Amino acid sequence: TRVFKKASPNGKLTVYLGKRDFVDHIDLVDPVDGVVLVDPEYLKERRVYVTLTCAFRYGREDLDVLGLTFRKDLFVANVQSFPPAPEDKKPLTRLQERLIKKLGEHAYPFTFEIPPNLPCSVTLQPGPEDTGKACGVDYEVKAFCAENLEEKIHKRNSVRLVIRKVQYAPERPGPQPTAETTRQFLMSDKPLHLEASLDKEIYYHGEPISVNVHVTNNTNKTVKKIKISVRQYADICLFNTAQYKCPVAMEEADDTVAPSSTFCKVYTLTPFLANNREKRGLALDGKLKHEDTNLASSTLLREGANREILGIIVSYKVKVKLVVSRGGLLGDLASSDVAVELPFTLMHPKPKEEPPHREVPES
Amino acid sequence: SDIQMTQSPSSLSASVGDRVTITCRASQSVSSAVAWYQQKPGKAPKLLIYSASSLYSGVPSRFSGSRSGTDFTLTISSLQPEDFATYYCQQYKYVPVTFGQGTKVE
């Protein structure tokens, strides 16, 4: 039907792509390929090269100069676009030959296959002071040419492209996570018991999630407050491993429970960007250039492999805590609170016949 | 600048079963961010085609449309008596959003 295209400043190169977003199925990954138009007389070196590459890039140390970002090459792959090589004796797609006929016998193909279990597209919420380029996981490809491979880039004779590595909600339903906990105290052997349950384990952005909680107050003290927590978990790996989390939303119920009694109730929360613009480093799905992409989707692991992947990984968990009135012979000296939490998933479904456009409401 | 939009013909009168087309074009490229709409007197509008080719659920096959460069078209392969109504070509690529004058069937 229709395709994209881009050309070089030198007015001698043109590229063509069938799509910009590429799906990862965990059990496999989509292949990427295409064709490029070239100007023969514009080159006499007898060598042309292009290179797909993936890396984790972001502000290097504290360099405020534009483009001074650490470049960690999580994956690199290259091919001599022209002249052809015996390693190119592989089949091609129908659209490729279509476009060859559309252009004639003066364009050459290219192809790549991603190795599974690589970091997916993601971005970190840049604060107002973050006037520099964005920080996140990127997948990009570039085209060029030279007479000797040692030759570096050339401004007028190069072109680059960007893509996104995404995921879609698994179709099969998952288990309904629920958890119960018990708490004892040292002056009364009637322990507290608590339980919380959810509706389902997968959800869509903007869709409310509800929780059902049961309370078992078996002791003399009384419950005073109940906190509701929905916290994002961030996995960071550049030099070593680090972990820290930020809450997207929370609520504190005012319910209280009498001594030696029980109670149950239900609560509902919704995450959204508007109430969180100010916060730095929030997990955001991979942008393209400057699009206001929604919150980052939970990144499913590599199935049961559980390998020590590099890059960034994200997930979410809901937690609840209980405030118990102080008293007895203890006062402020001891601790009283109890809590429990459950995991879940948030992510978009698989597009039916049309992947998301680029900021439809252009303004 | 909004999308200064033109669509024609205004309306047509004929017998049942014939094929009749309605054309649509805009002042600038819109790629495929286009849609078509239908409405009947005293009733709310209804969506027919989105992304310039997509068919909504429940639409009989005879509804059709296509893009040609910066010119756009919707068409019925063979009309039926119940199809007498108003129709609109619609774009959504930029704000402010703009509609067409409309269409008539007779």
Partner: peptide, 9 residues
């Protein structure tokens, strides 16, 4: 900037 093309397909 990138551009779009059609296909007589």
């Amino acid at each position: 900037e990138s551009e779009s093309s059609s296909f007589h397909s």
